[PDB]
Amino acid sequence: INPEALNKHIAEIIERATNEKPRKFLETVELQVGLKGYDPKKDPRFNLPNLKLCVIADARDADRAKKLGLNYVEIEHLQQFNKDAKQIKKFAKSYDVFLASKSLIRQITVYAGPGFTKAGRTPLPLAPDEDLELKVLECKVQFKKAVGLNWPIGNVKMPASEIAQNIMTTLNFLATQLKKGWQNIKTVYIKSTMGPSHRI
RNA sequence: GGGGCAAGAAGACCCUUUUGAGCUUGACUCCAGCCCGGGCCUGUGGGGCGGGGCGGCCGGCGCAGCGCACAGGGGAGGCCGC
């Protein structure tokens, strides 16, 4: 536990300062969890849920997405989709968040499903009456094949208490998805590109 | 000495009994013996080797782009000059 001392390290990361922050307070510090009993031979790979946000949408939804500064795509790349897939991975990688429209719904389910699914960037279709600008701005756990798991929780520019709440969401997650819970996790370390790690 | 299916003897053969016994073996279940390990008996000093935990450090070769991309990172600044 020790939230004050753990937050003292979160405070130290903000105090060293320096860095190249992108839409976050002191960039993002990701806790690297190590798993004491996890075997690739054993199969528990369940994958479950500012950096870069983006939306593709029509009436009402577009008004509150393009205004938010995310930027929008007019599916003019539908023309590019026939021509090339060279930047398909690149475009999806650039925007951590993709959003969509309920009016569009099946417009590209029949044609532009292609490489965008391999990239995993399936947008969230939002009713024009639905606000949309919240779910996109708000912005991770897969066992996969890697013992080391580091999920960004410093991406919020919100106070270190919210970052600790993101740490608590991360730690609640470690209790929920693991058989020994927090005991199953061998180690955790707070890091950024210029952020030295902090063993939890 | 032909016969009294003459006299000996609750057929020994054969079969039956939920009747035995001796023997056998890779029958069922076991037991002494013996081998082996650890503990106690059981004092007083050395020396090495692992494990566990920390903990630095050195590595990683199917090729376009920059060369063997171990992996999950992060990111327009750290300190590269990149």
User: Residue A2, CB, less than 7 Å from strand B?
Assistant: no
Q: CA of A62 and C1' of B49: distance in angstroms? A: 73
Give the CA dihedral A156, A71, A140, A160, nearest 10 degrees.
0
User: Using an 8 Å Cβ cutoff, are A10 and A160 in contact?
Assistant: yes
A26 burial (CB, 10 Å; 0-12 / 13-18 / 19+) is buried
Between vectors from CA A44 to CA A93 and to CA A156, what angle results, nearest 5°? 40
User: Beta carbon of A157 within 7 Å of strand B?
Assistant: no
Give the CA A30 to C1' B78 distance in Å. 18
- Asked if A163 and A154 count as a contact pair (C-beta separation under 8 A), the reply is yes
Within 7 Å: CB of A194 and strand B? yes
3-class state of residue A141 by DSSP:
strand
Q: In this structure, is the dihedral angle defined by the CA atoms of residues A169, A56, A64 and A90, taken in order, positive or negative? A: positive
CA-to-CA distance for A151 and A168, rounded, in angstroms?
A: 12
- This PDB structure is determined at a resolution in Å of 3.2
